Swiss-Prot record, chains A, B:
It catalyses: 3 reduced [flavodoxin] + 2 L-arginine + 4 O2 = 3 oxidized [flavodoxin] + 2 L-citrulline + 2 nitric oxide + 4 H2O + 5 H(+). This is Nitric oxide synthase oxygenase. Belongs to the NOS family. Bacterial NOS oxygenase subfamily. Keywords: Heme, Iron, Metal-binding, Oxidoreductase. This protein is similar to the oxygenase domain of eukaryotic nitric oxide synthases but lacks the reductase domain which, in eukaryotes, is responsible for transfer of electrons to the ferric heme during nitric oxide synthesis. The keyword Transferase does not apply. Tetrahydrobiopterin (H4B). Can also use tetrahydrofolate (THF) in place of tetrahydrobiopterin (H4B) but binds THF with much lower affinity than H4B. Heme binds at C65. One of its GO terms (biological process) is nitric oxide biosynthetic process. The gene is nos. Its EC number is 1.14.14.47. Catalyzes the production of nitric oxide. It comes from the Bacteria. Homodimer.
């Protein structure tokens, strides 16, 4: 069954991929080559070109992503050659540096060797390559609660955080053949952070908020033509609301709205005053202003939705069905001010695509 | 087939209804009575009690409604006795007066005779009993664009609006046996309106915005045990965002955000300034403040979502499955500040319920 699922996915992917690359004539022999290779080895190896275009198709098919307009300019780094943990570590350091690009963020994915018998070659433990630790003992919360279980897993392995609200977690990953993962402290010189200030309200700096420049998702599996690349971290630049309306605002995250309300000089006592909505807007203005001021790439939700409209139009003119998850595409502030809110989207899953996978801790 | 669909829906409704009313023992004979009545007459008549509880169940099952906590206190007016257009008109006038209740709004439904062969007895043309006219000729828009087709239909029948941005449309409905509907001007003494002012910003009154107090939906069919009440207008009180984030804000409605931005003293030039979001928040604060000041019932989206949480909890403790449409339940401003955003809902349709129907114009 496994080999048959593989062969079928291979067939579908090579046809579509080569059609898109104007290489439709080469499909026949490539398929024959693949079929033999699966018969002999139980799997098949992608060409550099197939892998790069597959990663791009995968982004293009990501129903929950509003930023898909730029799918075709994904920078794809092929690291199927890595065999040692030092090479894995160095590749992750490199991804951070080249994606950050002194603040002019390059959307990038680094692809590591794929699973074999469902057997991972490299198993990355981080949810994002750069993320803040979280702690909770005796009712006092420190840092990012979303990171508590990973943080506890790191500390069990001998890492220790300074217990600020913004401890950078170490890179942590396991190699095939090792029972324990290894971890490495992130060099601070590699990580850009932005302090949050407000364009008009001087007191906003009193909150001492900051966030990291580059979200680099490292817990999803890239699937391309039946090959499962479980370790393939990828990044874009942030949309402001991700930081302002969620990471810093959610009660189960940094929960900053009451403190924001206070520094902007409004009461946080009456639902009818819409103080949460107002705090949310000023916090989100501050996030966008701060990233721009530091020259770190970011996009606001209005501009992002306009870009996505163009993605829709581009899909139609290429004759490709559009897929999307309306529940994720609408921004969490003023959703009805975007065109997304007022239409519907087909939530069908199309491959290549990125998929969630189980984490080893948890 | 029709009689069989009817009988099946009757069976399901009477069982559930009587179970809820502690009258489970009476189900057997009531059903037998109904079965005979369908055999003879092709239909059946609800008791006062069945009709009232059915209307309430229908509200309870309305997946898109965040206000369902108060389902059991719906005020049900039984007007199955009406036969003349004067009686219809007077019943609609009465609904407006009693639902308005000098601003302390009573959630109310008036139920008119139901369809027979799919043949309506009373066909109401209004989408809401109280709504503003809309005009467009030579690129200048006046009033509410959502009302353009109905407005043109009224004027074709000899009504003429003053062409302010807030002309009250007349009541317009057709009786079985008449080819043309009739219309009646709304007595202004019956219609409460609220001028929109802002709690802090004096200049807000310069926009000369207002809205009507009571939304009374009159274009949906109430279905109860296979009986189709096509004419059964119902109302609640507004949630502020309906007025502030949609009716007054949507580009295809009153489109007021640029004017709001200007009176609140912010530029409307850069997406990154989040001027639309900020204008939306101040406009929504003004709407809530204005209704409260005038003593007209209204609810903000935070309070409304808290009430809905209780509706969920009440459903679970009664052993009733909960249904909902997440896409309508989240408010259009700060949705992620409500619990609704962070859970999912089963969108199954359960009857009794309210359903959209085709309009005669359009
Ligand atoms: C270039 C800038 C980018 C922006 C502004 C952007 C924006 C977003 C946003 C706002 C979300 C919703 C996230 C959430 O609410 O947690 C999202 C989800 C997603 N994006 Fe993008 N994105 C970008 C680039 C990329 C790239 C390069 C990829 C992959 C190659 C990608 C794949 C995805 C995926 C898979 C999700 C869903 C994640 C999940 O299920 O948790 N995006 N994106
Ligand atoms: C008492 C105060 C009430 C509040 C605050 C309230 C709130 C709302 C809101 C915000 C919506 C979404 C509307 C939209 O976006 O256009 C809605 C939809 C709805 N409500 Fe309620 N509601 C209330 C009372 C009622 C009552 C009394 C009924 C019926 C007996 C009802 C039945 C519905 C229905 C059927 C919809 C869906 C309408 C559609 O599909 O267009 N509601 N409600
Ligand atoms: C590449 C990228 C760019 C950008 N601007 N933003 C993102 C946001 O992705 C962040 C990730 C973190 C949470 O993951 C939650 C999650 C959990 C589970 C179990 C499944 C799933 N699909 N997603 C939500 N999306 C990713
Ligand atoms: C009873 C009630 C109370 C309250 N606070 N708000 C409401 C809002 O209902 C207003 C109505 C007007 C639009 O109707 C649109 C519509 C169109 C169509 C074709 C189907 C459908 N279900 N709904 C959206 N909901 C109703
Ligand atoms: C159907 C389409 O997604 C459309 O934008 C919906 C979305 N959610 C909504 N939610 C509410 N409350 N009211 C609406 O009119 C809509 N419109
Ligand atoms: C799944 C559940 O509805 C949950 O609240 C979703 C809704 N929409 C979302 N949209 C985005 N962009 N990000 C999220 O994490 C979520 N969470
Ligand atoms: Cl994030
Ligand atoms: Cl309305």
């Amino acid at each position: 069954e496994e080999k048959e699922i593989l062969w079928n996915e291979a067939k579908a992917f090579i046809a579509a991929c080569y059609q898109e690359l104007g290489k439709a004539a080469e499909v026949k022999d490539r398929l024959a080559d693949i079929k033999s290779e699966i018969d002999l080895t139980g799997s098949y190896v992608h060409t550099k070109e197939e892998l790069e275009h597959g990663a791009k198709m995968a982004w293009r098919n990501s129903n929950r992503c509003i930023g898909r307009l730029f799918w075709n300019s994904l920078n794809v780094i092929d690291r199927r050659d890595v065999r040692t943990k030092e090479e894995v570590r160095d590749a992750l350091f490199h991804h951070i540096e080249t994606a950050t690009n002194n603040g002019k963020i390059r959307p990038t994915i680094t692809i590591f060797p794929p699973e074999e018998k469902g057997e991972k070659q490299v198993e990355i433990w981080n949810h994002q390559l750069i993320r803040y630790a979280g702690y909770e003992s005796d009712g006092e919360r420190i840092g990012d609660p979303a990171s508590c279980s990973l943080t506890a897993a790191c500390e069990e392995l001998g890492w220790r955080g300074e217990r600020t609200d913004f401890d950078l977690l170490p890179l942590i990953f396991r190699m095939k053949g090792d029972e324990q993962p290894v971890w490495y402290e992130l060099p601070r010189s590699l990580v850009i952070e932005v302090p949050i200030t407000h364009p008009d309200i001087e007191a906003f700096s009193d909150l001492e908020l900051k966030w990291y420049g580059v979200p680099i998702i490292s817990d999803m599996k890239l699937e391309v033509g039946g090959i499962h690349y479980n370790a393939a971290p990828f990044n874009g630049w942030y949309m402001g609301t991700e930081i302002g309306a969620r990471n810093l605002a959610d009660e189960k995250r940094y929960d900053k709205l009451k403190k924001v309300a206070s520094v902007i000089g409004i009461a946080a006592d009456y639902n009818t005053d819409l103080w949460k909505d107002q705090a949310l807007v000023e916090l989100n203005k501050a996030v966008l202003h701060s990233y721009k001021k530091q020259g770190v790439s970011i996009v606001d939700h209005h501009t992002a939705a306009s870009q996505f409209k163009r993605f829709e139009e581009q899909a139609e003119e290429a004759g490709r069905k559009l897929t999307g998850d309306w529940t994720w595409l609408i921004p969490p502030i003023s959703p009805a001010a975007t065109h997304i809110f007022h239409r519907s989207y087909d939530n069908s899953i199309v491959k290549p695509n990125y998929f969630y996978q189980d984490k080893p801790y948890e």
